[PDB]
Nucleic acid binder design. Structure first.
Length: 371
RNA sequence: UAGCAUAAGAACUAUAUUCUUUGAAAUUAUAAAAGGAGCAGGUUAACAAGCAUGUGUUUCAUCGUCUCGUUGUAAAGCAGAUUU
């Protein structure tokens, strides 16, 4: 909810101590030795153990031992005689600036019906599935989140389709562009989502690859690309200023590009291994840092991503050419029976398969750079 | 402020007494100042009851979209580097 401001540690402590919306449960003879978690579970049936643990471990719920200081306790610590246990209230969470933990609130929303054809499409889309995670081959044209036009299809909309024998639908762990296809990961459970979210933040060891067909050939076969973006809002779209040097408000974008095989100076096949997440880092780096736009990228390589070189295969005047960028070989923490991590791949889309076949290069090949 | 001068034989001498006289130093000492290399820290940054010019607005992030909007989070979150 709104009216929640970012608070430093001192500000949070000051607000917590000043607020009068606190309930003090006395520890009597009957609840002396009872554990904190059991006491809270008994006294707050409406709350969930997740909320209990979050509050206790983040300090929103504490105890006062008459010691002149508020002790912050673990869930496994025993209580004591004639001591207070301070717990906030709905008033504490709402009528002030301190935001609550993202569980205790009772927010809810409606549902949405899906057609049998859509469910079958989702089932065919699914690639890998276990008790924790799903990896699906998101197509080219479909978007991930709802578009500026509410009446449009989306992966978020289709999410309930692959709610296999689970009460709650999975949650997307990361998002792809509306023009890029390939693997996308869904966490089945909330704990799985929290654990797997640490993969998609900025990292130094690549775990996924992007196969791209780029017009032109970079001067070097393998290398690293680093660009600092200063995304800002514009009239309708957003401006993306890219610079080589850092800046206070800029965000870095790092990738490792390997030219798997280049036909000639006209076209090339590149693999991008990103160490960072930014709006359109792969496309921007291919277009500017490498000076080799993707074969279907009109947003950056306008009139240059559609070359007359491949007039025999693709019509240069057909601006609807799908982007020749494909997410592939996402590596997951979960291992297999052989002891090695699970690397889920996605088959190349129709256009990239056609281009590879026409150039004579094989399509189904294992990328050793992502073990 | 009233009281305090003066006094001649017993010979090293006894914890007892607050008296001989200061009531306002009207700062600025310390020379002055600017932006490759050296040392140190941090790299799990710094800031955050915010921001913008009384008003409008959640924070940070998941590679959305052309304003709209899904999800997580309220830190287990956010700069830059992660090489031998």
């Amino acid at each position: 909810h709104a009216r929640y401001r970012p608070l430093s540690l001192r500000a949070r402590q000051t607000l917590s101590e000043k607020s009068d919306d606190l309930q003090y449960h006395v520890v009597t003879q009957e609840w002396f030795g009872e554990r904190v978690d059991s006491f809270l579970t008994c006294h707050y049936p409406q709350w969930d153990y997740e909320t209990i643990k979050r509050l206790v471990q983040q300090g929103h719920i504490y105890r006062y031992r008459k010691n002149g200081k508020k002790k912050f306790t673990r869930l496994t610590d025993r209580l004591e005689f004639d001591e207070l246990l301070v717990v906030p209230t709905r008033a504490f969470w709402e009528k002030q600036l301190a935001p609550p933990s993202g569980v205790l609130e009772e927010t809810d929303g409606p549902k949405f019906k899906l057609s049998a054809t859509a469910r079958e499409m989702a089932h065919n889309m699914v690639l890998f599935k276990n008790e924790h995670v799903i990896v699906i081959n998101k197509p080219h044209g479909l978007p991930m989140m709802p578009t500026d036009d509410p009446q449009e299809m989306s992966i978020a909309a289709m999410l309930p389709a692959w709610k296999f024998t689970n009460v709650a639908k999975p949650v997307v762990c990361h998002n792809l562009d509306r023009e890029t296809s390939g693997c996308v990961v869904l966490a089945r459970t909330r704990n799985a989502h929290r654990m797997l979210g640490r993969m998609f933040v900025k990292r130094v060891v690549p775990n996924s690859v992007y196969w791209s067909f780029c017009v032109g050939k970079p001067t070097v076969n393998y290398g690293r690309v680093r660009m600092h973006f200063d995304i800002t809002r514009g009239n309708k779209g957003d401006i993306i200023v890219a610079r080589p040097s850092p800046t206070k408000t800029s965000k870095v974008a790092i990738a490792e590009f390997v030219v798997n095989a280049s036909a000639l100076e006209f076209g090339s096949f590149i693999s991008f291994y990103p160490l960072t997440t930014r709006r359109h880092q792969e496309r921007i780096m291919a277009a500017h840092a490498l000076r080799c736009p993707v074969l279907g990228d009109a947003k950056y390589g306008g009139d240059a991503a559609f070359p007359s070189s491949l007039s025999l295969f693709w019509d240069p005047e057909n601006k609807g050419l799908p982007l020749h960028l494909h997410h592939r070989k996402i590596q997951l923490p979960y291992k297999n029976t052989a002891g090695e991590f699970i690397c889920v791949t996605a088959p190349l889309p129709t256009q990239m398969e056609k281009t590879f076949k026409k150039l004579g290069w094989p399509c189904e090949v294992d990328d050793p750079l992502i073990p």
